[PDB]
C-alpha cells in the first residue's frame, strides 16, 4: 500500500527546512521519505526515487523556493508525480509549499501555478498546521505509534486553539465613583476658639487643622459640643472656596496650593468613611497602614447579605470578609475598595498571631476565583448602601457626598471563552 509522504526539494540549499519538516512529521506518526534522511546510500538513487513515487508515495510534497523553481531534479520528480497523479485519479496528491518571500506566486512553475499552495512564508507553524488539515481531510494514513508523544505534539502544534477574539465585554472595577460633593469646602478661622492641644480625630465630623484654620465640609457651628467656646464664632471669617473649581484645578494661590488642597479633600473623605464604618457598627482590624472593617458572626441574618455567604467556618477558625476604602482623585473622584480575609477563634476575637492569620488567609483564598471576590465585594457595598443606587458619606449636618453602590464599569473589545 501507499503510506509514504515524499518531500521533493532543492538539496544544495533547502536541507534545513526539509529535515525539520520530516522530523516533525515522523514525530507526528506519519511515515516520511526524503533523500537527506531516508535515501539508502550506495544505491541507484533515481531508480529508488521512481519506485517510491510510483509505488508507495501516497502524498507528494514539494518545497518551492527561489532555487527549487528551476532545479532539474525537482522538475523530473515533479513530472513523475504528475504522471502518477494521472494514474491514481487524485487531484490532492500534490501540495506545493511556498518558502521564499521573494518567490512571488506569479513566477512559480506552471503545473504548480494551477495548484493551490499552502503558505509557509510567514510562519512555519501555520503552514505545518495546514498540512495537518490537508492530511486528515484527505485521510492520509497515520500510524498511531507512541500514541502519547504523537498526540501531545499534535496538540502542541495548535498555540492556535485559543487566541484573542474580538468580542465586547464589560468589566466591573473595585472603584466607587463619587456622585457629588458639597458646594464649598470651608476654612474656618477658629483660632483660639479651638484648643491648640486638641485632637481632631475624635471630633464628630471630619476636620483637618491647616495653618491656623480648621478645614471641613461641615457648617461652622456643627462642633459646639466638643468645642463649647465656638458658640460665639463669626461666620464672616469663613474662607469658602468653590469646591468644583478645586476639582477642576482652577483655584491656586498663596493661601492654598492645588497640590495640597487635593490632599486636604482625600483625608476628609477618609475620615468620613471611617466614621461611616463606625456608624454602621462594623468591627476593625489594624492592618500595617490602614484599618480594615469586617462583620461579626450573627450580626447579619444567618451571616449572609443578599445571596452570598460572608462569614463562615473552617475547623475552629471563623473567617470574615472585610473591605478597606481609600480615597483618590487622580483618575476620577474615587473610593477604591480592597478585599481582605480575617480569622477569629470564636467569631468575635481576632486571632493575634499574624502568621496564623496569613496562613489561614492563604488556605481560604486557595480556591476563590473572580466570582467569589466580585460578588462579595458588591454585597458588602450593598450592605453599606443607604438606598438602591448609592449611600452617603457625611461630613456635616447638611453636607454629604453620594457614593454609588455600583462599581465603575469599563468595556473590553477583546474577550475569550473556557
Amino acid at each position: 500500500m501507499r503510506n509514504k509522504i515524499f518531500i521533493s526539494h532543492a538539496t544544495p540549499d533547502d536541507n534545513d527546512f526539509t529535515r525539520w519538516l520530516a522530523l516533525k512529521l515522523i514525530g507526528l506518526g506519519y511515515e516520511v521519505w526524503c533523500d537527506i534522511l531516508f535515501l539508502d546510500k550506495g544505491v541507484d538513487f533515481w531508480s529508488n526515487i521512481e519506485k517510491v513515487i510510483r509505488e508507495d508515495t501516497c502524498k507528494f510534497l514539494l518545497v518551492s523556493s527561489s532555487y527549487s523553481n528551476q532545479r532539474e531534479g525537482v522538475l523530473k520528480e515533479l513530472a513523475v508525480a504528475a504522471k502518477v497523479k494521472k494514474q491514481l485519479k487524485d487531484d490532492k496528491f500534490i501540495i506545493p509549499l511556498a518558502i521564499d518571500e521573494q518567490l512571488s506566486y506569479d513566477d512559480i512553475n506552471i503545473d504548480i501555478v494551477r495548484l493551490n499552495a499552502i503558505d509557509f512564508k510567514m510562519s512555519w507553524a501555520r503552514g505545518l498546521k495546514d498540512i495537518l488539515e490537508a492530511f486528515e481531510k484527505q485521510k492520509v494514513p497515520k500510524e498511531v505509534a507512541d500514541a502519547s508523544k504523537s498526540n501531545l505534539l499534535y496538540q502542541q502544534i495548535f498555540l492556535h486553539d485559543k487566541s484573542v477574539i474580538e468580542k465586547e465585554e464589560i468589566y466591573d472595577s473595585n472603584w466607587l465613583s463619587i456622585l457629588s460633593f458639597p458646594e464649598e469646602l470651608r476654612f474656618h478661622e477658629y483660632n483660639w476658639m479651638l484648643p491648640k492641644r486638641f485632637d481632631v480625630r475624635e471630633l464628630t465630623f471630619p476636620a483637618v487643622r491647616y495653618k491656623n484654620y480648621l478645614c471641613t465640609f461641615a457648617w461652622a457651628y456643627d462642633f459646639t459640643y466638643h468645642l463649647p467656646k465656638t458658640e460665639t464664632y463669626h461666620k464672616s471669617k469663613t474662607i469658602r472656596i468653590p469646591t468644583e473649581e478645586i476639582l477642576s484645578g482652577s483655584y491656586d494661590s498663596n493661601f492654598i496650593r492645588n497640590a495640597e488642597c487635593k490632599r486636604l479633600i482625600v483625608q476628609l473623605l477618609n475620615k468620613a468613611f471611617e466614621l461611616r464604618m463606625k456608624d454602621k457598627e462594623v468591627q476593625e482590624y489594624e492592618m500595617s497602614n490602614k484599618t480594615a472593617y469586617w462583620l461579626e458572626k450573627g450580626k447579619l441574618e444567618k451571616d449572609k447579605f443578599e445571596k452570598t455567604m460572608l462569614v463562615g467556618k473552617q475547623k475552629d477558625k471563623n473567617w470574615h470578609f472585610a473591605i478597606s476604602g481609600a480615597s483618590k482623585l487622580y483618575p476620577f473622584p474615587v473610593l477604591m475598595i480592597s478585599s481582605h480575609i480575617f480569622f477569629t477563634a470564636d467569631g468575635k476575637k481576632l486571632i493575634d498571631s499574624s502568621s496564623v492569620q496569613h496562613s489561614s488567609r492563604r488556605r481560604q483564598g486557595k480556591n476563590w476565583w473572580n466570582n467569589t471576590w466580585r460578588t462579595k465585594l458588591l454585597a458588602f457595598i450593598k450592605y453599606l448602601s443607604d438606598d438602591d443606587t448609592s449611600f452617603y458619606l457625611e461630613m456635616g449636618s447638611e453636607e454629604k457626598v453620594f457614593v454609588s453602590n455600583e462599581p465603575v464599569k469599563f468595556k473590553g473589545n477583546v474577550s475569550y471563552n473556557i
Binding site: 507553524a125 471576590w373 473590553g412 473589545n413 473556557i418
Partner: protein, 473 residues
C-alpha cells in the same frame, strides 16, 4: 463608562528567523538561536546530593509528562529542545564532606556560619577553576536542606543542635554569587528539595514540595537557565526598534555600612548592528547616601548615563535617538537635569516610572476567570494602566492567581508616545531568561536590575563588576 484599548501580544524570535509569541513552545519546536555544541557541567557537593542530581538529569534527558497539557506544554527533553549535548558523563565533581559542612553549620552566629559555608564552597570552586585542566561551562552548586533552614537572616538555630563575617550578608545565595564575581564563573545554586523531592517527605507522608503535576516546568526552567548560563541565546525579541536604549534602574538597601547608602543598579537592552539584541547589565553601582532618598545625585547620574552611552557607541558607533529609562521610583528634577546634560542633542531622553501599588481591580461581569492580559486603560497622554499581569488564552490560565493588579505607567519626563511606551514594556516582560514562563509580571529590566542589586549588596569588596547576566541570575 470608560474605554480600554488592547495592545498586540509580542512575538519573540527563534531559530530560522521565525517568530513565536510563546517561549517554551517556541523553543520546543523551533530551536534556540545559537548552538552550544556541548555543556561541560561541574558539580560541587556531597555524596547523597550528587546521586539525586544524576537521577534528576537522567530523568530530564527523557521526556516528562504534565497532567494538564493546555495549561503547561509537553517537555520533549533537553537535547530535543536545545539540540545540545549535556549528560551525566563529564561532570567535574568536587567533594564537600558531611562532617566538614556540619562543623561550620552548627555555629551560634548566623553571619559567621553563613560566611564559613560560603567560603568553603567558593575556595573549592576557585581551586577547580585555577589548578585543573578540565574546563567547566557552568558550576552547579547543590546544598542540603538543613543549610536551607539555617543560613539566612532571622533563622534561629535550634538550641539543642548548636555546637559552637559581619561585613557580609547573611543570605547564602547573595553572598555566594557575590564573592565569585572576580573569577567570572557561571554558577547556579540548587536546593536538594528543588531536586528529586520524592525522597523528602513530611509528617503526612506526601513530599513536602510535591511537584507531581509541575515536574515539567521545573525541568523547563532549570534547562533554560542552564542553557543561558552556558552562553546560549534561548530567544530574542522581534519588535525592537533601532536606536533605542532602555536602562532599568533600581535602588537597594545596604546593612553593612551605617545608613543604607542605597546602592543603585541598572540593566540595558538595545539593538546592535544587524539583528543581534544586546541585553546586558549596566553595573557601575552608584551609592546614594541618606536613609530614604532614592533620588540620585547629579554627578553619579552623569557617570551612569555616560557609561551607558559608550556602552552603546562601542557596539553600534553612533548616538542613540531615543532613550526610554525605566525605574520603580519617581524621578525628580535635579537628576533629570544632570541626565539631560550628558544626553546629546538628537537623543530623546524619556523617563518612565513604573509601579504596582495602585489599587485597581477590574472584575469582569461573569466568569471564573480574570481580565485578559494586554488590556490597557489610558488615563491620559502621560499615564495609563497596562495589565501586564492577567489572562492570556494560550496558556489556558491567568498569569495571575487571584484578581490581578495592573501596572501604572507614567511618562514622568520627556514626551514619549504613551501607546508606544506600553508597546515596549510588554515586550520586555518576555525576556525572562531565569524562568521558562510565558510572561513575567514586571519588565525584565527592572527585574534583572533588582537581582543584580540584591547580589551586589552582599559583598562590599566588589570592583569593576561583570556586566554579564550569567554571573548573576
Amino acid at each position: 463608562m470608560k474605554e480600554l484599548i488592547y495592545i498586540e501580544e509580542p512575538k519573540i524570535l527563534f531559530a530560522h528567523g521565525q517568530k513565536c509569541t510563546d517561549a517554551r513552545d517556541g523553543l520546543a519546536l523551533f530551536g534556540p538561536l545559537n548552538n552550544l555544541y556541548g555543556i561541560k557541567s561541574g558539580v560541587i557537593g556531597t555524596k547523597q546530593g550528587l546521586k539525586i542530581f544524576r537521577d534528576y538529569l537522567d530523568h530530564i534527558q527523557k521526556p516528562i509528562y504534565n497532567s494538564n497539557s493546555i495549561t503547561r506544554p509537553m517537555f520533549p527533553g533537553f537535547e530535543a529542545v536545545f539540540d545540545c549535548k549535556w549528560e551525566s558523563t563529564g561532570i567535574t565533581f568536587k567533594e564537600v564532606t558531611n562532617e566538614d559542612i556540619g562543623k561550620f553549620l552548627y555555629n551560634s552566629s548566623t553571619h559567621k556560619r553563613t560566611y564559613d559555608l560560603v567560603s568553603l564552597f567558593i575556595d573549592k570552586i576557585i581551586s577547580a577553576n585555577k589548578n585543573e585542566d578540565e574546563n567547566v561551562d557552568v558550576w552547579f552548586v547543590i546544598v542540603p536542606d538543613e543549610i536551607y533552614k539555617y543560613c539566612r537572616p532571622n533563622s534561629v538555630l535550634p538550641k539543642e543542635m548548636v555546637q559552637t563575617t559581619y561585613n557580609y550578608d547573611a543570605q547564602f545565595h547573595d553572598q555566594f554569587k557575590a564573592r565569585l564575581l572576580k573569577h567570572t564563573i557561571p554558577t547556579q545554586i540548587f536546593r536538594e528539595s528543588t531536586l528529586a523531592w520524592r525522597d523528602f517527605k513530611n509528617a503526612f507522608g506526601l513530599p513536602i514540595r510535591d511537584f507531581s503535576k509541575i515536574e515539567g516546568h521545573l525541568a523547563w526552567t532549570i534547562s533554560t537557565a542552564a542553557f543561558y548560563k552556558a552562553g546560549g541565546k534561548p530567544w530574542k525579541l522581534s519588535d525592537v526598534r533601532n536606536g533605542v536604549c532602555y536602562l532599568g534602574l533600581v535602588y537597594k538597601k545596604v546593612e553593612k555600612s551605617k545608613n543604607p547608602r542605597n546602592a543603585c543598579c541598572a540593566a540595558q537592552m538595545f539593538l546592535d548592528n544587524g539583528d543581534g539584541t544586546v541585553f546586558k547589565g549596566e553595573v557601575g553601582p552608584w551609592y546614594n547616601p541618606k536613609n530614604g532618598q532614592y533620588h540620585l545625585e547629579p554627578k553619579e547620574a552623569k557617570a551612569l548615563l555616560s557609561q551607558s552611552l559608550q556602552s552603546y557607541k562601542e557596539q553600534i558607533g553612533e548616538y542613540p535617538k531615543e532613550v526610554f529609562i525605566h525605574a520603580k521610583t519617581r524621578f525628580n528634577h535635579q537628576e533629570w537635569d544632570a541626565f539631560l546634560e550628558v544626553t546629546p542633542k538628537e537623543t530623546n531622553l524619556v523617563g518612565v516610572t513604573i509601579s504596582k501599588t495602585k489599587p485597581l481591580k477590574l472584575y469582569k461581569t461573569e466568569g471564573d476567570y480574570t481580565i485578559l492580559r494586554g488590556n490597557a486603560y489610558v488615563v491620559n497622554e502621560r499615564s495609563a494602566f497596562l495589565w501586564t499581569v492577567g489572562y492570556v488564552p494560550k496558556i489556558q490560565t491567568a498569569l495571575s492567581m487571584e484578581v490581578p493588579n495592573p501596572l501604572f505607567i507614567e511618562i514622568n519626563k520627556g514626551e514619549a508616545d504613551i501607546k508606544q511606551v506600553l508597546k515596549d514594556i510588554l515586550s520586555l516582560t518576555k525576556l525572562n531568561y531565569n524562568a521558562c514562563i510565558f510572561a513575567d509580571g514586571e519588565p525584565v529590566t527592572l527585574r534583572f536590575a533588582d537581582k543584580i542589586g540584591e547580589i551586589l549588596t552582599a559583598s562590599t569588596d566588589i570592583k569593576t563588576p561583570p556586566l554579564a547576566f550569567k554571573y548573576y541570575i
